[PDB]
């Protein structure tokens, strides 16, 4: 007994997988884990979740991608679908939830046909052609392609959902400020870069007290006085505030006495001349992250000047644009044309946090900053996280066009339409696309799960009400009424592109994870 | 010698749902009891000493909580709230927990 | 025996190690055989570091499939050479190898001493190559000819659609590559990849793309007309090679020492700007600079006030492509500065992606360097397609290199087989055995093709084993019906040297492989 | 506790037999490996690589042991290999077998010294024997050398490629003759560089009329193809190099710092114009190259290579006859890189290579090996190494020996003729060594696999007739064959050290009586 | 320790120039004597190597101290720790030269070792060993090493003793009788 | 697959285990093919207890050559019948067996 | 390296010998030991010999068999 044989000792200790068995079973099972891992995730009724990393750091979250980024997965294909959505969020923002759902259902249905014995490759083709067709029929469902660039009311109504999607509690506040955010920025460096928005977390003073400023902030100290001027004269220097230290070693050497007297005196004297020359231009505030000479700030204080400290390269880069003034690597030339110019700048005390305020009014267009108030930073991290995703949404909204109906409704048309094309395929692949159409049921199905009401009849009711073209009606959000709601009046819309891409990526995810048969795994 | 592929790392714990949810609720209740006596004109104060041996008495629970190095996560949220309220208004942070 | 000499040593024996080695390849070929043939399956690898593959070209598999059996590692090396020689068919090459050794074993298992069979192989390849030499089809560099060949090669790895998209880019590159005599495939081929927006949209760019961007916000992102500065001399500060300790006595001198130090680079940038201003007196024109080293921020500012595009820290080969792009005269000394030394582009912008920056070169009148910018949805796939790409190119370079071409899909091997089976023992007789199996081993390619295609092997071989008439054709196996096919008519081709070298490579591999007896391992602790 | 504290010692016959046994092993492990019908072995280096090679030396050079005389036997192999190259296919197998019978008188209680004494007598006649049965050959005639070479190489796997190597070996060998020693010119096999590149085929590998460099043009603007270039070997670097005296500068005035930086520019440019003044075309140096000068040398359209290995620089110098320089100002036109028939830099496939052809009468050359895989290639060159080595030995002596065991039997009876005429106790050792000689053709039989005993007796019987001495053993037929038609011909000196080495082995191991371990120093 | 400090950059080229010219002129000064063979246990620079090739010269670096002492005693050379003169200038004299018929480096066992033939100043003798393994040679020289001494002693003392153990053969008995002389214990 | 059922379990697969047995039997036959025939050689076996054989009837040899491969032991049983049936050509049976599978493979 | 292959793992740990090598070499040498063991044995000039058994019992001997009886040879 106890003695099997090996025809291939090729491996030093490693995992050879083959026979489609893992493909037919283990690969599929792994993906099915991910679905359940985040099945609760999407849904206005879907709930948040927290995790600590391998370094034991809290992460309360509603987004899948972030937690997925917080999951050290080890199975091969799991990461693939992870990384697929990972870029997808890097592509669109929210959707992480949905595409993961797309990932499983297509996976979940596929094995059954594979278990039914259809050609593995044929699965690809039917899945493929269906996807291409699915994209093809997709634009025919766009409604309310909202056009107003710079109104608050339209965009807020649009943006509400994604905030609503990942935060059910406080949409009204979040939209208007974030709508205020989008309107406050124009295309200045070109069509509202997401990075143009800054987020500051301050614990305490619950979320309702959070607001947005038309300028920028720093939770930083100051060295001299504290003033804000109606006409602010801002001085920006990546240069540290010290006598320009020649990088190569000039140490003073003396040969007679008086150089001692002269040198330090002039050493003082020209620094006064340096800072005066700055003040001659009227600069009332000077900024840098670099080192500050004590006499120099001593001089600035003598000249009623404001100073900024220890800021990162990004911090100056943000501010440089804010007043649109150029940072000067050369310390001397307080250029008028390149001189900072702000509405008002001072220091505030909020949540027991020394806070430097750049309170601005910028008609030419400004990268404003959002104030976050509320107790648990854990809340801040997600509560910024969702707004950030909304930020993408606006930008992705701002990308091209064409609001489309959310709330699963569009998916119901998709299935029926794809189902409809299914029987017009006819061929052995017909089942696969037939299954391909079916998988889209998962969204409202999962939505029902996160609603926690009997799904199938709702699905059938939604089917039935969708047999009359009712593309604007979809799944309600209500324990009282587990039947239906019309999204159009509800405004529960979404992006064409987000749905469009997420469809493709999940498609790509499949064919890939579907493609492979046998695997090899070296010992880590 | 095939082996099934695990989902995440060995010992990557998960517990879900009602029993999962309630555990924190008890855990939060556990937290307050350490602060239950605290606030009040006839209230209470505690002494906690670090593993270093430097003792530390406190009547402000937020201070006590900061001493109370929590390992449960959801409870740390409670601990965070204290800092916020302490960064806001102070005692009654005591109450805030309760 | 020598175990007497050393206890910890290990030895095999003639019978023993012989079986071991053939057993080794027999296993090795078994895994890889799934791959070659368009119906084949690429394989995904996971590092112990957790990295990920989606590959099909076996050399990648062999190089990364951690195995210890020595012969395989030996076989791995030549396969890598073949990868350094042509790129695919390494697939077939090993499949050729073990299967030959398997057929080889059959006779020595009948006690035949291997030395005889080797000579049979020696004669066998000779006649085969003799046939191989005559049968290659002399074909011109017709765009379609190569196009089909590219599609012939590229289908081995990816979607039919994906390669078809890929097919157009590579060939046109090939067209835009030759100076009608000599390709080197290194400069004119830029393979850059971005995790961006699709797999399919990966495209040739008529110009060039860069892996970094300007280091200043005021830097112009986009310029209509680009006048090019190719250089490598640092415009970062530098202090001279000799210890040169200076002092001063006045802080005034300290500042005077400030300005003096900068002055050298000050002139350097000054020379260019005047040239730029000597060149770009017009406002419309845009001026771009490329450095292989870094650039001073003050210098950056120097260009900034002049609105000058400049780039730093380029890989040493990029400028060649730049010279191959804009005709720019790559220089070091700016004192000898001439407008004729310049390069010109019809369009430049920068593309910002993710956190990185990518820069775009457009509209050379007669570009001689181009770029395979790889658009990617997924990192492995970018790596995945890239191998398919580089494979695809190297197919073409030989394809143009050889004014002849081999019709692919193993139609040759039957042609090899019938001609070789049509060899009397003009040999000393005993070698006709080894020749027979040698010819026998050749039919594996369609066999696995049908096998990878799922069609039953034995019957199909017999089917295609029908040279029809006086026109006993170069007949392929259909890759989707398992049926006789004119690869030439259907345009399924291959590089002659590919077919050439692989036979040679495998043969030499084979004979020596059969010509070992024990495998020694007596090494220091 | 007295002597050396756990250092083992042994003495006498057990020692004697033990050394006798180990060599018997030592020879035995290779007896498969000689002859045109030999086998071919592949080895595990301790660190993972593979070497597959028939030449015994490397095999033993790749052998780890504990018993000393084996290691003692090891070096003997490499020494003769070093001096002769091959015969290592045979010498040790001769050696142990000599010992194998050499023991046979130990039980005869005969003191080894006399047995040694006969041996020195024995070799003397042996050397005298071969000189009598040697044959001088013309060295100008190529084809016999080619015949000799194939005769020398029809033992290794390159057998299928004899034509190529034979000319290949001859050509490089002929082109290496350094006549400044008067008529005592000497060839070198370290200027006989060997370059192994995988890919391609054996047929593609060829002798290059010049040198091959695994490097590239420093700048594209330098041409990659030139007919009759001029080449510079700058031993010195091309850039500014330390003021060796921990030099220091103290500037005080502003312009000084900028001034000095030009000066290094000036210093470099200085070097450039000194170079161009000789109107050169190609620049080669073992050190780095300033791109700024390289701009200048680009400005002069003069080809430049940096950081080239010194031995190649010599062979490059020996290629184009020019002499290396470390002093651009003291560079001399007598070392102009003239003797350059064609300049080029090809693309091997992922590697640029430097192509230096058609020197007028070059003395240095590298052989380009283009094959399947480097272990295949490395095996090839070892055979090439032997092939070229024997040729120079042929270029060292024109006197030739017919091998195939024919010579071996010739001495064997010759000593038997000596043996019966040399009455005394020492006679029996004398014939015994003759008895030892007979095994090599016998060994050849097994590698063929024929009726060894019958053939050997007949061969001895065949060689009993004085009229015929070239009768030897065919490699493949395993039949008695006169060598004259067979043509397996060998350098006499090859066989000399063979026996010279063989007998030296014998005496050295014989005087042994003792083993001592644990020296601890 | 001698520091080189520059406040006037204009001569550093000249400074760096002479740094080797000293070695160069020393090369020139010794070469002008026409000397054709030189040894130096010290290191030899490539600049010197280049110059000697221009001379077609012969030079050695890193030669063991004792042998060149034998060389100077053999060839009649003067080993020179440096170039000098009773006057301060470092000068060199042909009278310092060593002389011999012919010098060759020859590759024995494929390794070129240098041969010296017949120094006229003082006749020299050296011996080249040939053997099978390194084990054989290093022992046989010891016997050779001892081989010299015994003859040297015979040269040292013009007197001999017959070998083969006769000594005690005579001694034993002569003492055996001599023992009886003492009468003690 | 069944590794899911049990970790300490061991299982093969179709191509795999098939390949095992043929090698096992082919490996088995190679040892014994030295035996049968008057020109054949009997083989000497050494017990762990130091006992000794000089037989050529492989039945003793197989029965006494300790192998762990099951098919070989499987072979041992049927041969054990055959020797209990006739005694020689037991040799033939196994050599018959393996070379049969060899061609079958 | 570090991983040769076995064409027959038939043995759970045992010694299989083949190739005549033991017969041509190892079989002979062991026999040669026995000759060397008792070469001195016989003879009016042949001298006696003693050996201790595994149970530490003295045996002075000239007869080969008895001393041979004292040898657990393997």
Curated annotation (Swiss-Prot), chain B:
Q: Where in the cell is it found?
A: Cytoplasm
Binding-site residues for ATP, renumbered to this chain:
40, 92, 95
Q: Locate the residues binding ADP.
A: 40, 92-95
Residues annotated as carrying N6-acetyllysine in the record are 66
Amino acids binding Mg(2+): 91
**Record's family?**
Belongs to the TCP-1 chaperonin family.
Q: What does this protein do?
A: Component of the chaperonin-containing T-complex (TRiC), a molecular chaperone complex that assists the folding of actin, tubulin and other proteins upon ATP hydrolysis. The TRiC complex mediates the folding of WRAP53/TCAB1, thereby regulating telomere maintenance.
**What interactions and quaternary structure are annotated?**
Component of the chaperonin-containing T-complex (TRiC), a hexadecamer composed of two identical back-to-back stacked rings enclosing a protein folding chamber. Each ring is made up of eight different subunits: TCP1/CCT1, CCT2, CCT3, CCT4, CCT5, CCT6A/CCT6, CCT7, CCT8. Interacts with PACRG. Interacts with DLEC1.
Q: Which disease is it linked to?
A: De novo genetic variants in nearly every subunit of the TRiC complex, including CCT7, have been found in individuals with a broad spectrum of brain malformations, and clinical phenotypes ranging from mild to severe epilepsy, developmental delay, intellectual disability, ataxia, and other features of cerebral malfunction.
- Kindly provide the name given to this protein in its UniProt entry: T-complex protein 1 subunit eta
Q: Which organism is it from?
A: Homo sapiens (Human)
| Residue window of the full protein shown | 2 to 99 of 543
Swiss-Prot record, chain C:
Q: What residues does Mg(2+) bind to?
A: 88
E.C. code = 3.6.1.-
Per UniProt, the keywords (alphabetical) are: Acetylation, ATP-binding, Chaperone, Cytoplasm, Hydrolase, Isopeptide bond, Nucleotide-binding, Phosphoprotein, Ubl conjugation
Enumerate the catalysed reactions: ATP + H2O = ADP + phosphate + H(+)
Keyword Metal-binding found: no
Where, in this chain's numbering, is ADP bound? 37, 89-92, 156-157, 409, 494
Annotated GO MF terms: ATP binding; ATP hydrolysis activity; ATP-dependent protein folding chaperone; protein folding chaperone; RNA binding; unfolded protein binding; WD40-repeat domain binding
Modified residue annotations for N6-acetyllysine: 3, 197, 285, 363, 375, 386
Cite the location of the cross-link Glycyl lysine isopeptide (Lys-Gly) (interchain with G-Cter in SUMO2) from the record: 249
User: Cross-referenced PANTHER family, in alphabetical order?
Assistant: CHAPERONIN (PTHR11353)
Q: What does this protein do?
A: Component of the chaperonin-containing T-complex (TRiC), a molecular chaperone complex that assists the folding of actin, tubulin and other proteins upon ATP hydrolysis. The TRiC complex mediates the folding of WRAP53/TCAB1, thereby regulating telomere maintenance.
Q: Which family does it belong to?
A: Belongs to the TCP-1 chaperonin family.
Subunit structure, as described in the record: Component of the chaperonin-containing T-complex (TRiC), a hexadecamer composed of two identical back-to-back stacked rings enclosing a protein folding chamber. Each ring is made up of eight different subunits: TCP1/CCT1, CCT2, CCT3, CCT4, CCT5, CCT6A/CCT6, CCT7, CCT8. Interacts with PACRG.
Any idea what this protein is called?
T-complex protein 1 subunit zeta
> Gene of origin?
CCT6A
UniProtKB/Swiss-Prot annotation, chain E:
According to the lineage, what is the superkingdom?
Eukaryota
What are the N6-acetyllysine sites (modified residues) in this protein?
152
Subcellular location per the Swiss-Prot or TrEMBL entry? Cytoplasm, Cytosol; Cytoplasm, Cytoskeleton, Microtubule organizing center, Centrosome
Residues where ADP binds: 164
Q: What does this protein do?
A: Component of the chaperonin-containing T-complex (TRiC), a molecular chaperone complex that assists the folding of actin, tubulin and other proteins upon ATP hydrolysis. The TRiC complex mediates the folding of WRAP53/TCAB1, thereby regulating telomere maintenance. As part of the TRiC complex may play a role in the assembly of BBSome, a complex involved in ciliogenesis regulating transports vesicles to the cilia.
Q: Which disorder does the record name?
A: Intellectual developmental disorder with polymicrogyria and seizures: An autosomal dominant neurologic disorder characterized by a broad phenotypic spectrum. Main clinical features are developmental delay of varying severity, intellectual disability, seizures, and polymicrogyria. Additional variable features are non-specific pyramidal or cerebellar signs, and visual impairment.
The family annotation for this protein states: Belongs to the TCP-1 chaperonin family.
- Write down what this protein is called: T-complex protein 1 subunit alpha
Swiss-Prot record, chain G:
Q: Where does ADP bind?
A: 42-43
Record: disease: De novo genetic variants in nearly every subunit of the TRiC complex, including CCT8, have been found in individuals with a broad spectrum of brain malformations, and clinical phenotypes ranging from mild to severe epilepsy, developmental delay, intellectual disability, ataxia, and other features of cerebral malfunction.
List-wise, which residues carry Phosphoserine? 18
Q: What does this protein do?
A: Component of the chaperonin-containing T-complex (TRiC), a molecular chaperone complex that assists the folding of actin, tubulin and other proteins upon ATP hydrolysis. The TRiC complex mediates the folding of WRAP53/TCAB1, thereby regulating telomere maintenance. As part of the TRiC complex may play a role in the assembly of BBSome, a complex involved in ciliogenesis regulating transports vesicles to the cilia.
Residues that span the membrane, as ranges: none
Q: What is this protein called?
A: T-complex protein 1 subunit theta
Family affiliation: Belongs to the TCP-1 chaperonin family.
Subcellular localization? Cytoplasm; Cytoplasm, Cytoskeleton, Microtubule organizing center, Centrosome; Cytoplasm, Cytoskeleton, Cilium basal body
From which lineage does this chain's organism come? Eukaryota, Metazoa, Chordata, Craniata, Vertebrata
Modification type Phosphotyrosine: residues: 25
């Amino acid at each position: 007994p106890k003695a099997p044989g090996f025809a291939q000792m090729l491996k030093e200790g490693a995992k050879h997988f083959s026979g489609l068995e893992e493909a037919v079973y283990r690969n599929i099972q792994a993906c099915k884990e991910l679905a359940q891992t985040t099945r609760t995730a999407y849904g206005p009724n879907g709930m948040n979740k927290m995790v600590i990393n391998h370094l034991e750091k809290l992460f309360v979250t509603n987004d899948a991608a972030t937690i997925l980024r917080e999951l050290e997965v080890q199975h091969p294909a799991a990461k693939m679908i992870v990384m697929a959505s990972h870029m997808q969020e890097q592509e669109v923002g929210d959707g992480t939830n949905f595409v993961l759902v797309f990932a499983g259902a297509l996976l979940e249905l596929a094995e059954e046909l594979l278990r039914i014995g259809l050609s593995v490759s044929e699965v690809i083709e039917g899945y493929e052609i269906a996807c291409r067709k699915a994209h093809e029929i997709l634009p025919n469902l766009v409604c309310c392609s909202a056009k107003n660039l710079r109104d608050i009311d339209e965009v807020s109504s649009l943006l509400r959902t994604s905030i609503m999607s990942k935060q059910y509690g406080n949409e009204v506040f979040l939209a208007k400020l974030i709508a205020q955010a989008c309107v406050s920025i124009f295309p200045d460096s070109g069509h509202f870069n997401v990075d143009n928005i800054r987020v500051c977390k301050i614990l305490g003073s619950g979320i309702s007290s959070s607001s947005v400023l038309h300028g920028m902030v720093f939770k930083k100290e100051t060295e001299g006085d504290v003033t804000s001027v109606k006409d602010a004269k801002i001085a920006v220097y990546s240069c540290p505030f010290d006598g320009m230290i020649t990088e190569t070693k000039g140490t003073v050497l003396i040969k007679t006495a008086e150089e001692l007297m002269n040198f330090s005196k002039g050493e003082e004297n020209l620094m006064d001349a340096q800072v005066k020359a700055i003040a001659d231009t009227g600069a009332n505030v000077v900024v840098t992250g670099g080192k500050v000479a004590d006499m120099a700030l001593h001089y600035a204080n003598k000249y009623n000047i404001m100073l900024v400290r220890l800021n990162s390269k990004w911090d100056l880069r943000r501010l440089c644009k804010t007043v649109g003034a150029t940072a000067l690597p050369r310390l001397t030339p307080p250029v008028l044309e390149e001189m900072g110019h702000c509405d008002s700048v001072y220091l505030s005390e909020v949540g027991d946090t020394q806070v430097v305020v750049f309170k601005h009014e910028k008609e030419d267009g400004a990268i404003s900053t959002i104030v976050l108030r509320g107790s648990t930073d854990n809340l801040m991290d997600d509560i910024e996280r969702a707004v950030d995703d909304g930020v993408n949404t606006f930008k992705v909204l701002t990308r091209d066009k064409r609001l489309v109906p959310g709330g699963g409704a569009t998916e119901i048309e998709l299935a029926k339409q794809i189902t409809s094309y299914g029987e017009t395929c006819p061929g052995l692949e017909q089942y696969a696309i037939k299954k391909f159409a079916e998988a889209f049921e998962a969204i409202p199905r999962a939505l029902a799960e996160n609603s926690g009401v009997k799904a199938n009849e709702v699905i059938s009711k939604l089917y039935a009400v969708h047999q009359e073209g009712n593309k604007n009606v979809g799944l309600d959000i209500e324990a009282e009424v587990p039947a239906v709601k019309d999204m159009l009046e509800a405004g529960i819309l979404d992006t064409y592109l987000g749905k469009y891409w997420a469809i493709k990526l999940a498609t790509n995810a499949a064919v890939t994870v579907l493609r492979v048969d046998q695997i090899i795994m070296a010992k880590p | 010698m095939p082996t099934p592929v695990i989902l995440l790392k060995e010992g990557t714990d998960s517990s879900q749902g009602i029993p999962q949810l309630v555990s924190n609720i008890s855990a939060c209740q556990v937290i307050a009891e350490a602060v239950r006596t605290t606030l009040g004109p006839r209230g209470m104060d505690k002494l906690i000493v670090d593993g270093r041996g430097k003792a530390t008495i406190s009547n402000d629970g937020a201070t006590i909580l900061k001493l109370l190095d929590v390992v449960h996560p959801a409870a740390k949220t409670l601990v965070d709230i204290a800092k916020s309220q302490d960064a806001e208004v102070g005692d009654g942070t005591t109450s805030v927990t309760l | 025996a020598v175990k007497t000499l050393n206890p910890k040593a290990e030895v095999a024996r003639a019978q023993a190690a012989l079986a071991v080695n053939i057993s080794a390849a027999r296993g090795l070929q078994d895994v890889l055989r799934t791959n070659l043939g368009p119906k084949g399956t690429m394989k995904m690898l996971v590092s112990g570091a957790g990295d990920i593959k989606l590959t099909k070209d076996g050399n990648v598999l062999l190089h990364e499939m951690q195995i210890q059996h020595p012969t395989a590692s030996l076989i791995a090396k030549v396969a890598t050479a073949q990868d350094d020689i042509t790129g695919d068919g390494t697939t077939s090459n090993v499949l050729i190898i073990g299967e030959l050794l398997k057929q080889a074993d059959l006779y020595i298992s009948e006690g035949l001493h291997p030395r005889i069979i080797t000579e049979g192989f020696e004669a066998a390849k000779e006649k085969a190559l003799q046939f191989l030499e005559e049968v290659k089809v002399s074909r011109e560099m017709d765009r379609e000819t190569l196009i089909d060949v590219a599609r012939t090669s590229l289908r081995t790895k990816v979607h039919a659609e994906l390669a078809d998209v890929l097919t157009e880019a590579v060939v046109d590159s090939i067209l835009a590559i030759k100076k009608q005599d000599e390709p080197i495939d290194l400069f004119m081929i830029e393979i850059m990849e971005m995790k961006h927006k699709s797999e399919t949209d990966t495209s040739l760019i008529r110009g060039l793309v860069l892996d970094h961007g300007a280091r200043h916000p005021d830097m112009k992102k986009r310029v209509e007309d680009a006048y090019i500065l190719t250089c490598n001399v640092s415009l970062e500060y530098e202090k001279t090679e000799v210890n040169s300790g200076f002092f001063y006595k006045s802080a005034e001198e300290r500042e005077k020492l400030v300005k003096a130090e900068r002055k050298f680079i000050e002139d350097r940038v000054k020379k260019i700007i005047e040239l730029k201003r000597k060149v770009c007196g017009d406002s419309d024109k845009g001026f771009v600079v490329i450095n292989q080293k870094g650039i001073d921020p003050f210098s950056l500012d120097a260009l900034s006030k002049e609105g000058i595009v400049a780039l730093r820290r380029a890989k040493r080969r990029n400028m060649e492509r730049l010279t191959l792009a804009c005709g720019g005269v790559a220089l070091n000394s700016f004192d000898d500065l001439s407008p004729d030394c310049l390069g010109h582009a019809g369009l430049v912008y920068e593309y910002t992606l993710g956190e990185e920056k990518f820069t775009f070169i457009e509209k050379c009148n007669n570009p001689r360097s181009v770029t395979l910018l790889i658009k990617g949805p997924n990192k492995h796939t970018l790596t995945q397609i890239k191998d398919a790409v580089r494979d695809g190119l190297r197919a073409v370079k030989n394809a143009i290199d050889d004014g002849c071409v081999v019709p692919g899909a193993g139609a040759v091997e039957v042609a090899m087989a019938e001609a070789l089976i049509k060899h009397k023992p003009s040999v000393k007789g005993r070698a006709q055995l080894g020749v027979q199996a040698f010819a026998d081993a050749l039919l594996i390619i369609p066999k696995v093709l049908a096998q990878n295609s799922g069609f039953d092997l034995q019957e199909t071989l017999v089917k295609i084993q029908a040279e029809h008439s006086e026109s006993g054709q170069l007949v392929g196996v259909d890759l989707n019906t398992g049926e006789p096919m004119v690869a030439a008519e259907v345009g399924v081709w291959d590089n002659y040297c590919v077919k050439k070298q692989l036979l040679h490579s495998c043969t030499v591999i084979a004979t020596n492989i059969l010509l070992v007896d024990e495998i020694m391992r007596a090494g220091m602790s | 506790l007295v002597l050396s504290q756990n250092t083992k010692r042994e003495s006498g016959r057990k020692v004697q037999s033990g050394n006798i046994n180990a060599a018997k092993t030592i020879a035995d492990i290779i007896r498969t490996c000689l002859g045109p019908k030999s086998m071919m072995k592949m080895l595990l280096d301790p660190m993972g690589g593979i070497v597959m090679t028939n030449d015994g030396n490397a095999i033993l050079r790749e052998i780890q042991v504990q018993h000393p005389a084996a290691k003692s036997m090891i070096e003997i192999s490499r020494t003769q290999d070093e001096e002769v190259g091959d015969g290592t296919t045979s010498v040790i197998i001769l050696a142990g077998e000599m010992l194998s019978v050499a023991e046979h008188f130990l039980e005869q209680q005969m003191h080894p010294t006399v047995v040694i004494s006969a041996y020195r007598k024995a070799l003397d006649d042996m050397i005298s024997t071969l000189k009598k049965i040697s044959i001088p050959v013309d060295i100008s005639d190529s084809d016999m050398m080619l015949n000799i070479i194939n005769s020398s190489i029809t033992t290794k796997a390159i057998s299928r490629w004899s034509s190529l190597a034979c000319n290949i070996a001859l050509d490089a060998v002929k082109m290496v003759q350094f006549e400044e020693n008067g008529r005592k010119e000497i060839d070198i096999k370290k200027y006989a560089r060997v370059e192994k590149i995988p890919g391609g085929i054996i047929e593609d590998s060829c002798v290059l009329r010049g040198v091959m460099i695994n490097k590239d043009v420093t700048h594209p603007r330098m041409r990659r193809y030139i007919k009759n270039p001029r080449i510079v070997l700058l031993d010195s670097s091309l850039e500014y190099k330390k003021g060796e005296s921990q030099t220091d500068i103290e500037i005080t005035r502003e312009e000084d710092f900028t001034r000095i930086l030009q000066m290094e520019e000036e210093y470099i440019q200085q070097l450039c114009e000194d170079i161009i003044q000789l109107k050169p075309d190609v620049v080669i140096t073992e050190k780095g190259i300033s791109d700024l000068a390289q701009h200048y040398l680009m400005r002069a359209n003069i080809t430049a290579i940096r950081r080239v290995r010194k031995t190649d620089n010599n062979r490059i110098a020996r290629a184009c006859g020019a002499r290396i320089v470390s002093r651009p100002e003291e560079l001399r036109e007598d070392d102009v890189g003239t003797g350059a028939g064609l300049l080029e830099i090809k693309k091997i496939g992922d590697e640029y290579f430097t192509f230096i052809t058609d020197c007028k009468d070059p003395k240095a050359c590298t052989i380009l090996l283009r094959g399947a895989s480097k272990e295949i290639l490395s095996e090839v060159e070892r055979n090439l190494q032997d092939a070229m080595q024997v040729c120079r030995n042929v270029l060292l002596d024109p006197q030739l020996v017919p091998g195939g065991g024919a010579s071996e039997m010739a001495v064997a009876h010759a000593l038997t003729e000596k043996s019966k005429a040399m009455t005394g106790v020492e006679q029996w050792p004398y014939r015994a060594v003759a008895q030892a000689l007979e095994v090599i053709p016998r060994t050849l039989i097994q590698n063929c696999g024929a009726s060894t005993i019958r053939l050997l007796t007949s061969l001895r019987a065949k060689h009993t007739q004085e009229n015929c001495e070239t009768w030897g053993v065919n490699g493949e037929t395993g039949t008695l064959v006169d060598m004259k038609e067979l043509g397996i011909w060998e350098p006499l000196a090859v066989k000399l050290q063979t026996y010279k080495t063989a007998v030296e082995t014998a005496v050295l191991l014989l005087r042994i009586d003792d083993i001592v371990s644990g020296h601890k120093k | 320790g001698v520091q080189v400090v520059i406040t006037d950059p204009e001569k550093l080229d000249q400074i760096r120039q002479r740094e080797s010219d000293i070695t160069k002129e020393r090369i020139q000064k010794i070469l002008a004597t026409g000397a054709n063979v030189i040894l130096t246990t010290g290191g030899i620079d490539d600049m010197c190597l280049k110059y000697f090739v221009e001379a077609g010269a012969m030079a050695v670096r890193r030669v063991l101290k004792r042998d060149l002492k034998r060389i100077a005693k053999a060839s009649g050379a003067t080993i020179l720790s440096t170039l000098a003169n009773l006057e301060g200038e470092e000068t060199f004299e042909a009278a310092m030269l060593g002389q011999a018929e012919e010098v060759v480096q020859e590759r024995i066992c494929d390794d070129e070792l240098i041969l010296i033939k017949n120094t006229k100043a003082r006749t020299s003798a050296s011996i080249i060993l040939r053997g099978a393994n390194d084990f054989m040679c290093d022992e046989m020289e010891r016997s050779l090493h001892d081989a010299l001494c015994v003859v040297k002693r015979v040269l040292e003392s013009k007197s001999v003793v017959p070998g083969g153990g006769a000594v005690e053969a005579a001694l034993s008995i002569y003492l055996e009788n001599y023992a009886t002389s003492m009468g003690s214990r």
